[PDB]
Structure 1
């Protein structure tokens, strides 16, 4: 009781090719449904949509949410990382938790005294076998404060199963963690544990110095030939003929290449300028989506894509990318100024543009009496010969996701971007221990429903040891970098207004340094 359960170890340090990091933060803990379980479907509803049907259970437990970056890296540091390395991969992960306390609450006549009940407890555990429905990879708010000095409550916990409208199937499952071992914990006593990642491809945080169509030499010509003439051109007469030619520096467009662009999914385009968009509500109808088991759901953010082509800064994919909201944003119908969009001009290097056709192809075989057929392609799969780059990550973005334990998975690279694993870090869950109120003087068959409402709190931290491939480029010309513009601004960046609320100016990318293709 009279001894700290540890020190506040929160720093960023660089010893060379590795980087260690940790962030201490203070949390709180509220009970839920008075330690009771629940069932959820079109109940505390919305009305009727096989597409908005669900089935799950709200449990009296809580969990941790730190699958983002602005939670482990202060801005500046992140920057440091960006301008010097090409890629990185997180290897080690530690976890500490301490300085627990317990508070009770008596609300008498509106007058409520809050003292502590040092003798109460809690219990937490981990799932190293991943038998519990994974909850992360959904970017649910309530992540560790992007900021360090603020404090927060731990979001309750609830999962779902295979459902059929407002009813469940037989195969639907139902779990209860009260079935799992858990290091019990009383005040003053500490708890920590440790895990280590496994092998993963360093997410390449850089752009390309060339595009798939300009990888050849401009001073020469391919020693091959290609079709350049279907008809004669020598006067005023048209006849069937065949003119073949090589590929020159002036006809680069036709030169035979060796590789192929990446996969694609056409999407409707939209403008940041309100008046340039058609006047029709197509948010849900003209939207790109897939059909599964009758429930039609959107396809966001969809595959890896390019936001727009050159100078189309006015447009972006309908639901092809990420979006962020400056601090102080609410739940619905907010405008474009309370948000921030993601620019993906960095991939025009190799991947197609969402609002663009993949390309054209033919539908028939012509003859002297048959016209040359030509169709379009807005849907595209992959073939041998393609190469692409997954979605880039953002500081205010997600970090990794749980690879579905299945028999078939392909280039499991998540769509929101990040890292996947067959055995991801674990989920840690905690709850306030139940403590009943004054029970009757005689017996009563039924269980109890009266308890002392209370809550507990404390501070925690996490260590992350990563790997990084420092740059070796000998580009002579000075590359681009990330910096806060040097002009004068009333409110600094990543500062806190005269009120203490901490907000970010813009979202941040990583594909800044240009490495050769």
Structure 2
């Protein structure tokens, strides 16, 4: 009915043993996109570009619901609870509701704007439960539910890309009509809901290692293996020899080991002290990249690698880490104090440093003549016996990604962080039903071009159940914990200021507790 509410405001968190259930409700507004039309888009329509930036695709009159960020579900305090008390977590169940739909019509006279209710208009909503549409979630896009529950947000417009040759299309390109799906139609008084079960995924590692991969031995006992220690008796000619020694606590670098650090793809090193950087432009020319069909793409963020060495936190890889913007930061050429650079220093115990060579390999045969020659390894692929950690997740970062439907993949954990699934939470698509203005009184076969100006508003609720993996550590000394600082300040961190603006002052990871290797 018109006078009865279709749902209530549900927003809290329940901590139930080894489960936590988060619930979020937000207020959304949806405009009419594209004047109800499907439009072909390309870099031609955007004004042209280089070959690396060419594309072809379509924008649709539909919008979509995205909640693929952790702050859509966790408050900062709840995130603190989770990361300070658990070794792991993963999503299990999802429930989604859309309710209290209101459709408004806008009339603009010469000098006045009037907004009225349109009680008989509809919104169309459907889920892509069979994964038949291009999946644009999982590209770290704007338009998710806002972190602050009081913020009213605008629903982003749906569009997609297909195969391109420059700004042109090939015969293999696909065009999708979203009206060619069955969808539910809602007047003011109807609601929509659905449930979803997550795939079985591994727990995320919300811990750091308290041991290093090269320091796993007993520091008191020798090995029963020998290593070559000398090849010449001394100075002079014809001094060749072979001497062997026991590998022990005095020489840990030469001990035999069972496991080796994971793969690498070297990045350029950039200092936040700008005077230490080379006085030249190297953002694009000095960057690591990969090529596909003649197009170059930045290797960003790339394989999970440690950001810097010990004591070198002023250095960061060129495109090897996630960079978030601070509240109120612009979009073009902002200074370093306006952005937030994450660092994966916790994985330095298993993962190679991002701005270093993996190691050295022999490159010749020494003989009595050529000396022994070695070469640097700048990119090392997977080898048997390698171990590694994945990239951390953040309160501001993405949760899941869709694994591409391919013949083969390896370790399909998404490179920007999170859970990779073949059947992720489905896309939820929504659109205001077009309402024509007065048609002519003589028949015309052309499609109608005049429409009543409308938009819609409502409430959306998402509830996720997460499974937790508790710590049972035997460590004696206290752990490192995420904490607020007592020292006085003008504002409270993770709160509003005097003007009403909510901000997140820093990125928060998940790795504070410790575990052995």
- In the alignment, is residue 501 of structure 1 matched against residue 501 of structure 2? yes
SS in 1 for 2:94: strand
State how 1:96-175 maps to structure 2 within 5 Å: 96-175=97-176
Q: 1:48 offset after TM fit, Å?
A: 3.2
Give me the whole-angstrom Cα distance separating, in 2, the residues matched to 1:51 and 1:74. 39
Give me the whole-angstrom Cα distance separating, in 2, the residues matched to 1:70 and 1:238. 70
- In the alignment, is residue 452 of structure 1 matched against residue 452 of structure 2? yes
Query: Match of 1:36?
Result: 37
Query: Match of 1:5?
Result: 6
Query: Match of 1:410?
Result: 410
Query: Match of 2:462?
Result: 462
Query: Match of 1:77?
Result: 78
Give me the whole-angstrom Cα distance separating, in 2, the residues matched to 1:74 and 1:81. 11
Give me the whole-angstrom Cα distance separating, in 2, the residues matched to 1:407 and 1:291. 20
Structure 1: stretches of 5+ with no match in the other structure: none
- In the alignment, is residue 373 of structure 1 matched against residue 392 of structure 2? no
Give me the whole-angstrom Cα distance separating, in 1, the residues matched to 2:168 and 2:44. 11
CA change 1:275–1:132 in 2 (3 A) is same
- In the alignment, is residue 289 of structure 1 matched against residue 250 of structure 2? no
Give me the whole-angstrom Cα distance separating, in 2, the residues matched to 1:174 and 1:236. 78
1:293-330 C-alpha deviation (Å, 9 max, x unpaired): 01111110011111000011110101110011111011
SS in 2 for 1:501: coil
SS in 2 for 1:87: strand
SS in 1 for 2:116: coil
Give me the whole-angstrom Cα distance separating, in 2, the residues matched to 1:238 and 1:274. 52
1:315-370 C-alpha deviation (Å, 9 max, x unpaired): 01011100111110111100101111112110111000111010001110111121
- In the alignment, is residue 313 of structure 1 matched against residue 296 of structure 2? no
Q: 1:46 offset after TM fit, Å?
A: 4.3
Q: 1:485 offset after TM fit, Å?
A: 1.2
Q: 1:9 offset after TM fit, Å?
A: 1.3
Query: Match of 1:221?
Result: 222
Q: 1:292 offset after TM fit, Å?
A: 1.1
Give me the whole-angstrom Cα distance separating, in 2, the residues matched to 1:485 and 1:307. 25
Give me the whole-angstrom Cα distance separating, in 1, the residues matched to 2:249 and 2:371. 32
State how 1:129-278 maps to structure 2 within 5 Å: 129-233=130-234, 239-278=239-278
SS in 1 for 2:190: coil
State how 1:50-65 maps to structure 2 within 5 Å: 50-65=51-66
Q: 1:490 offset after TM fit, Å?
A: 1.5
Give me the whole-angstrom Cα distance separating, in 2, the residues matched to 1:144 and 1:277. 39
Give me the whole-angstrom Cα distance separating, in 2, the residues matched to 1:178 and 1:46. 29
Q: 1:47 offset after TM fit, Å?
A: 2.7
Q: 1:480 offset after TM fit, Å?
A: 0.5
Give me the whole-angstrom Cα distance separating, in 2, the residues matched to 1:446 and 1:469. 61
SS in 2 for 1:123: strand
Query: Match of 1:327?
Result: 327
Give me the whole-angstrom Cα distance separating, in 1, the residues matched to 2:49 and 2:98. 44
Give me the whole-angstrom Cα distance separating, in 2, the residues matched to 1:194 and 1:462. 10
**TM-score normalised by length of structure 1:** 0.98
Aligned length: 516
Give me the whole-angstrom Cα distance separating, in 1, the residues matched to 2:324 and 2:30. 28
State how 1:322-471 maps to structure 2 within 5 Å: 322-471=322-471
Give me the whole-angstrom Cα distance separating, in 1, the residues matched to 2:33 and 2:209. 51
Q: 1:43 offset after TM fit, Å?
A: 2.8
SS in 2 for 1:149: coil
Q: 1:513 offset after TM fit, Å?
A: 0.6
Q: 1:505 offset after TM fit, Å?
A: 1.4
State how 1:458-497 maps to structure 2 within 5 Å: 458-497=458-497
Query: Match of 2:22?
Result: 21
Give me the whole-angstrom Cα distance separating, in 1, the residues matched to 2:453 and 2:236. 96
Give me the whole-angstrom Cα distance separating, in 2, the residues matched to 1:129 and 1:217. 54
SS in 2 for 1:83: helix
Structure 2: stretches of 5+ with no match in the other structure: none
